[PDB]
Copies of this chain bind each other. A is one copy, B any other.
Amino acid sequence: DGRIFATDALEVAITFVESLDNRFMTSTASRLSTVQREIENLETRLNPNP
C-alpha cells in the first residue's frame, strides 16, 4: 500500500545487536518474582488433586 514495513527477519536481526553491548539486559530484578508467581499459579493449576 506504499507503506513499507520491517520484515520479522530484520526484527530478529536488530533484536540481536541490541542485546550485545553493555546495556539494560533482557532480565531485570522483578523477573525472578515474576517467575515465582508464575510457578505458583501453574503448579496450583496442574495439580489435579482437589
A residues lining the B interface (CB < 8 Å): 12, 16, 19-20, 34, 37-38, 41
Min Cβ gap A36→B in Å is 11
Number of copies: 2
Residue of B nearest to A19 (CB): B12
Give chain B nearest CB distance to A33 CB in angstroms: 9
- CA distance in complex: A20, B13 (Å): 9
Please report the C-alpha to C-alpha distance between residue A20 and residue B34 in the assembled complex, in whole angstroms: 27
- Nearest B residue to A38 by beta-carbon distance? B34
Instruction: List chain B residues, Cβ under 8 A from A38.
Output: 34, 37
Q: Please, which residues of chain B bring their CB within 8 A of the CB of A37?
A: 37-38, 41
Residue of B at shortest CB range from A20? B12
